[PDB]
Design an enzyme around this catalytic site. Structure first.
Site, PDB file in Angstrom:
ATOM      1  N   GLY A   1       5.130 -18.742  53.219  1.00  0.00           N
ATOM      2  CA  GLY A   1       4.170 -17.742  52.790  1.00  0.00           C
ATOM      3  C   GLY A   1       4.221 -17.525  51.290  1.00  0.00           C
ATOM      4  O   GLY A   1       5.300 -17.496  50.699  1.00  0.00           O
TER       5      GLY A   1
ATOM      6  N   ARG B   1       6.467 -28.739  44.046  1.00  0.00           N
ATOM      7  CA  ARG B   1       7.218 -29.199  42.880  1.00  0.00           C
ATOM      8  C   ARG B   1       8.339 -28.237  42.486  1.00  0.00           C
ATOM      9  O   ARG B   1       8.187 -27.018  42.565  1.00  0.00           O
ATOM     10  CB  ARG B   1       6.285 -29.447  41.692  1.00  0.00           C
ATOM     11  CG  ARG B   1       5.691 -30.849  41.647  1.00  0.00           C
ATOM     12  CD  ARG B   1       4.650 -31.060  42.735  1.00  0.00           C
ATOM     13  NE  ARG B   1       4.180 -32.443  42.783  1.00  0.00           N
ATOM     14  CZ  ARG B   1       4.555 -33.333  43.697  1.00  0.00           C
ATOM     15  NH1 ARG B   1       5.406 -32.987  44.654  1.00  0.00           N
ATOM     16  NH2 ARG B   1       4.075 -34.568  43.659  1.00  0.00           N
TER      17      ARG B   1
ATOM     18  N   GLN C   1      13.937 -20.663  39.975  1.00  0.00           N
ATOM     19  CA  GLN C   1      13.806 -19.499  40.843  1.00  0.00           C
ATOM     20  C   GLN C   1      14.948 -18.510  40.622  1.00  0.00           C
ATOM     21  O   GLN C   1      16.007 -18.873  40.109  1.00  0.00           O
ATOM     22  CB  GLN C   1      13.737 -19.932  42.308  1.00  0.00           C
ATOM     23  CG  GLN C   1      14.807 -20.931  42.704  1.00  0.00           C
ATOM     24  CD  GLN C   1      14.408 -21.771  43.900  1.00  0.00           C
ATOM     25  OE1 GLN C   1      15.008 -22.811  44.167  1.00  0.00           O
ATOM     26  NE2 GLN C   1      13.386 -21.327  44.624  1.00  0.00           N
TER      27      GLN C   1
ATOM     28  N   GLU D   1      15.922 -18.843  58.385  1.00  0.00           N
ATOM     29  CA  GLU D   1      15.190 -19.443  57.277  1.00  0.00           C
ATOM     30  C   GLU D   1      15.694 -20.864  57.047  1.00  0.00           C
ATOM     31  O   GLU D   1      16.854 -21.171  57.318  1.00  0.00           O
ATOM     32  CB  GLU D   1      15.356 -18.616  56.001  1.00  0.00           C
ATOM     33  CG  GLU D   1      16.742 -18.699  55.379  1.00  0.00           C
ATOM     34  CD  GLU D   1      16.832 -17.965  54.054  1.00  0.00           C
ATOM     35  OE1 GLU D   1      15.786 -17.493  53.561  1.00  0.00           O
ATOM     36  OE2 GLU D   1      17.951 -17.858  53.505  1.00  0.00           O
TER      37      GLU D   1
END
Ligand SMILES: NC(=O)c1ccc[n+]([C@@H]2O[C@H](COP(=O)([O-])OP(=O)(O)OC[C@H]3O[C@@H](n4cnc5c(N)ncnc54)[C@H](O)[C@@H]3O)[C@@H](O)[C@H]2O)c1
Lengths: 823, 207
Positions: free
Chosen positions: B43, B58, B62, B155
């Protein structure tokens, strides 16, 4: 004719020589055509900033003996004529009244064959109700000769019946306080001609011609050139008997001296009798020039008639000699144009057209200009003199001597002459003249009254509302034309202060207006001018309001996406008094929070505690909805305030019921838990939380919807008044009052009419009254529907469902649990 | 091209344009026919969706510890649903809904997928994960599945090298423009999409 700013001022100084008037005519009767003749003849030019033509300035000059015939105080031979622009169709009733209110005289155009149409009849009725003096011109005479090929006597009798019909309307609706104001051809208050070919005449013009050939004062000759006067050709004798001694028919003077000359030219020219034409032209002393001497047929006929009887001359003659000056008219139009005491110091100043007294300037409309998106105030000075830099009391519609509601004491930047499309700055402007003002568009929406006395009431106000009650979705058919629509919308919103162009959350381009017609003309202006691209437009939709009428069944709670922030709140209804106060500026967002709180507490029964803890209004940061901070010891509460307010702006703009704006919704933030670190409580976290909690709280406060309601004022002859009630009885209409005009058979019916029931109202009312009714409706109030909006079968629910589907939303309205914390 | 047949696909608040459940079933089938397999949902916001579907996944910087860097997806769309929205408002405070994406990898990468009971993105789990994948973090041509938080849903973290070999298509599960921040309603998940959303069997033991 070119003039300098000086020459204009010296002409505006002599008010006795000014003519404030308009043109009452059907568009199909050559209204614009006759107007062109005037501007091309007496049009005043000036020896950067453009405006929408609202008024035209004309200049006419006459003789010492011409001015002598004027039965009102005059000064000099020069005359300034203000030609106020008029709407094209009666449907634009509100702006029809606007133009008439600032005029004193009227040039009423009537067709030769068709006579007086229903529209022109209704408008003249209103003009007379405004105490305006009429002068008539019978147009399209050409058609009677070229097509119908009528006889002189037939044409005369046709004019006679026409003049009769006009006076039947005049004598019936003209105010008794003006005396006989009927029009009579023999008195020069009636002209004849064809705007098409640009020719026209009055009895006076022909009386002047034959005044010498008969050794008679044109006053007597004029009286003979109409009616039962006969000049026997054989005996060269004047008679009142339509037959000679032997009982042979005698031709009336009008037919013999006026029509005959014209008829002979029409016959000689259109029959290409090259041998007769020259002789006939020299006879009337009509000289042609070079190229003109080779013309034939209609081409020649138009040139000959044009220089034989210039149309503008006949019209200007009537306007200057018969139409009242500002001085004359204001003496009997003051009481009617003043919403206060008749013996007031200002009302008296208006009666006397006193340039020295307190300023009494009337603003009829705002005019779009090239100076950015600003509007110049168009109007008339009824008392005192307006000046550049002068500080004036801007009194809005809702203003009343005593309260300071709807009042703005500012200063006029520049006062300018509205020379049609152009603007000329001047120093001042005495009473009696029409003028434009710069730097007021931010205090007056459209109509207003400017004064200088702290005890002056507003002048007869023209009700208006900017509330967008109807709207549509605009979409280009060709994707490439998108940019052209984007700028077209920004352009459309500038040519009219009452038009609204915005984008819904979904991204749709929305165009909202004040009525069915108003929105209609806007969409046509857009697809042809402001944009010019092929547009896909959805059917007209009525704007509603989402509201609550109880406190939330239970506390509303919602978490942030990261699960670290919680907002507890509760919704509750705001009193109509308070919502009205907010909408009317009384309770203001930009107001000092303490001054405002005192007002809400003292005048509206609010806890001054809550009133001081208002976080924002909404939507658009000023709407009739409020967030109240009722939290206790919430650490870092202020660090999310900007987010909470923002969320509220979106939540109120489009509600949970069916995307409609909220109204009268008070949100009490009861509690807030925040993450210690600011990183985890930014806009991305807080906004959705507040917005969802609001929706949850709203739904828990038994939701309702409100519908817009018009206030309709209709003028109508007693005979057809019955049709007014016939239409209203199937439109959920509610009669407010029925009043009759003293003396006349004119009734004024006022009633409430739901906006969603007004679609095609004017058309239905038209037939039901034979076109006699004169509609005029403005937004009045919102009305809460009793039915449950959540019930798909109820009236409110039915409305919701249809809307939901149309927007592609889920049919059923979301339960509060959806927005409530899922647990 | 893995988007199937139809009009140009685009992402909007009003929903993913030219993307029906039927077209999805075609895109999904054609993916499997070319040796690709579904591994979960991602999402994100509209512009990111456009980038990911048409330009590919790509690598990017983060906000986390270097060792746990990679592409994050969830087997259960509800978990991924929570991230399918703007993280920052515009100047006016608009927070738009985003879009759910379906993530596919070459079946040849399956041997690199592992699972654990430990909570990911935590130092106490770095050891077990490095044991399972047979080398020190970060993840590379391998993936790890486990609770995104204690007692929380699962996850999956695709190592950036593996993430860049994905094929991503739109989901038929819509976000709610009129309920941004709300949870995914199971009833809004097309039954025919649930039918093609089984996850592969991940290894609990190192190679
Ligand atoms: N996003 C999900 O669906 C998801 C699933 C499971 C867990 N999580 C949890 O959410 C946290 C946030 O992860 P995240 O992925 O939402 O943010 P992130 O910081 O891991 O990635 C940054 C953003 O860049 C975007 N992007 C734009 N173009 C891209 C491209 N071409 N290739 C790859 N990414 C591109 C991604 O959509 C992503 O939202 C993670 O720590 C994870 O624990 C998220």
């Amino acid at each position: 004719v070119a003039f300098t700013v000086d020459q204009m001022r010296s002409l505006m100084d002599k008010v006795t020589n000014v003519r404030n008037m308009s043109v009452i005519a059907h568009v199909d009767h050559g209204k614009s055509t006759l107007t062109d003749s005037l501007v091309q003849r007496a049009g005043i030019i000036s020896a950067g900033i453009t405006i929408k033509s609202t008024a035209i300035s004309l200049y006419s000059e006459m003789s010492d003996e011409d001015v002598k015939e004027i039965k009102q105080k005059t000064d000099g031979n020069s005359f300034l004529i203000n030609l106020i622009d008029s709407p094209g169709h009666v449907d634009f009733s509100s702006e029809v009244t606007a133009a008439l209110r600032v005029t004193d005289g009227a040039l009423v155009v009537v067709d030769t064959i068709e006579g007086v149409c229903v529209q022109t009849e209704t408008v003249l009725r209103q003009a007379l109700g405004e105490r305006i003096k009429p002068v008539v011109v019978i147009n399209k005479v050409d058609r009677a000769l070229l097509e119908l090929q009528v006889s002189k006597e037939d044409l005369y009798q046709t004019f006679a019946r026409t003049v009769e019909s006009v006076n039947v309307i005049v004598s019936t609706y003209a105010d008794e306080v003006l005396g006989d104001v009927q029009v009579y051809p023999a008195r020069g208050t009636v002209a004849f001609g064809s705007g098409l070919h640009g020719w026209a005449f009055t009895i006076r013009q022909f009386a002047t011609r034959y005044a010498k050939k008969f050794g008679v004062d044109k006053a007597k000759m004029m009286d003979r050139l109409w009616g039962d006067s006969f000049f026997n050709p054989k005996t060269k004798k004047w008679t009142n008997k339509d037959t000679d001694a032997e009982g042979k028919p005698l031709e009336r003077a009008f037919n013999m001296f006026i029509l005959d000359p014209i008829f002979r030219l029409f016959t000689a020219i259109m029959n290409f009798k090259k041998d007769e034409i020259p002789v006939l032209l020299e006879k009337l002393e009509i000289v042609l020039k070079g190229d003109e001497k080779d013309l034939e047929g209609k081409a020649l006929l138009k040139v000959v008639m044009r220089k034989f009887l210039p149309a503008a001359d006949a019209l200007l003659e009537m306007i200057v000699l018969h139409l009242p000056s500002p001085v004359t008219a204001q003496a009997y139009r003051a009481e009617q144009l003043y919403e206060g005491p008749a013996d007031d110091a200002n009302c008296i100043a208006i009666k006397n057209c006193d340039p020295k007294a307190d300023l009494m300037l009337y603003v009829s409309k705002m005019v779009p200009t090239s100076d950015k998106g600003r509007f110049y105030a168009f109007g008339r000075v009824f008392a005192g003199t307006v000046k550049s830099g002068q500080k004036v009391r801007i009194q809005g519609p809702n203003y009343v001597p005593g309260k300071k509601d709807d009042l703005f004491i500012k200063a006029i930047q520049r006062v300018v002459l509205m020379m049609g499309r152009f603007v000329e700055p001047i120093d001042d402007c005495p009473a009696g003249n029409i003028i434009g003002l710069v730097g007021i568009d931010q205090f007056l929406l459209k109509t207003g009254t400017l004064t200088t006395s702290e005890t002056a009431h507003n002048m007869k106000v023209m009700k208006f509302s900017v509330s967008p009650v109807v709207q549509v979705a605009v979409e280009v058919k060709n994707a490439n034309d998108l940019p052209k629509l984007v700028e077209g919308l920004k352009r459309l919103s500038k040519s009219d202060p009452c038009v609204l162009t915005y984008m819904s959350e979904s991204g749709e381009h929305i165009v909202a207006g004040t009525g069915e017609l108003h929105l209609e003309i806007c969409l046509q202006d857009l697809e042809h001018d402001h944009a010019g691209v092929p547009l896909k437009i959805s059917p007209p939709v009525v704007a509603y309001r989402e509201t609550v009428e109880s406190e939330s069944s239970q506390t509303a709670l919602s978490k942030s996406p990261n699960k670290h922030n919680r907002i507890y709140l509760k919704a509750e209804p705001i009193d109509e008094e308070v919502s009205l106060a907010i909408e009317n500026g009384i309770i203001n967002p930009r107001d000092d929070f303490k001054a405002r709180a005192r007002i809400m507490a003292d005048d509206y029964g609010w806890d001054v505690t809550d009133a001081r803890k208002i976080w924002c209004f909404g939507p658009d940061g000023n709407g009739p909805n409020l967030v109240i901070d009722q939290t206790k010891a919430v650490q870092y509460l202020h660090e999310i305030k900007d987010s909470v307010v923002a969320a509220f702006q979106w939540a109120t703009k489009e509600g949970p019921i069916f995307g409609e704006e909220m109204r009268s919704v008070r949100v009490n933030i009861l509690d807030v838990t925040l993450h210690a670190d600011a990183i985890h409580r930014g806009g991305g976290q807080i906004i959705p939380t507040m917005r969802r909690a609001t929706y949850a709280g709203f739904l828990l406060a038994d939701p309702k919807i409100q519908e817009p309601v018009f206030l309709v004022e209709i003028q109508c002859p007693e005979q057809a008044v019955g049709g007014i009630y016939s239409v209203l009885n199937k439109k959920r209409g509610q009669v407010v009052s029925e009043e009759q005009r003293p003396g006349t058979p004119l009734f004024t019916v006022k009633a409430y009419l739901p906006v969603n029931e007004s679609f095609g109202f004017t058309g239905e009312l038209r037939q039901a009254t034979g076109g006699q009714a004169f509609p005029q409706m403005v937004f009045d109030h919102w009305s809460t529907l009793g039915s449950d909006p959540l019930d798909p079968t109820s009236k409110a629910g039915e409305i919701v469902l249809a809307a939901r589907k149309r927007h592609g939303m889920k049919e059923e309205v979301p339960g509060w649990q959806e927005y409530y914390d899922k647990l | 091209a893995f988007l199937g047949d139809g009009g140009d696909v685009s992402f909007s608040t009003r929903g993913t344009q030219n993307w029906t459940v039927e077209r999805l079933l075609q895109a999904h089938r054609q993916l499997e026919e070319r040796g690709y397999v579904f591994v979960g949902y991602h999402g994100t916001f509209l512009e990111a969706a456009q980038s990911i579907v048409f330009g590919g996944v790509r690598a990017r910087s983060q906000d986390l510890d270097a060792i746990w860097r990679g592409f994050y997806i969830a087997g259960d769309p509800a978990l991924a649903y929570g991230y399918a929205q703007d993280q920052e408002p515009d100047a006016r405070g608009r927070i738009r809904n985003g879009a759910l994406l379906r993530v596919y990898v070459p079946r040849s990468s399956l041997p690199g997928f592992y699972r654990t009971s430990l909570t990911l993105a935590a130092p106490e789990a770095a050891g077990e994960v490095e044991r399972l994948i047979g080398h020190p973090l970060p993840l590379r041509l391998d993936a790890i599945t486990g609770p995104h938080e204690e007692g929380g849903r699962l996850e999956t973290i695709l190592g950036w090298p593996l993430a860049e070999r994905t094929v991503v298509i739109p989901s038929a599960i819509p976000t709610d423009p009129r309920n941004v921040g709300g949870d995914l309603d199971p009833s809004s998940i097309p039954d025919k999409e649930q039918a093609i959303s089984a996850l592969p069997d991940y290894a609990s033991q190192p190679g």
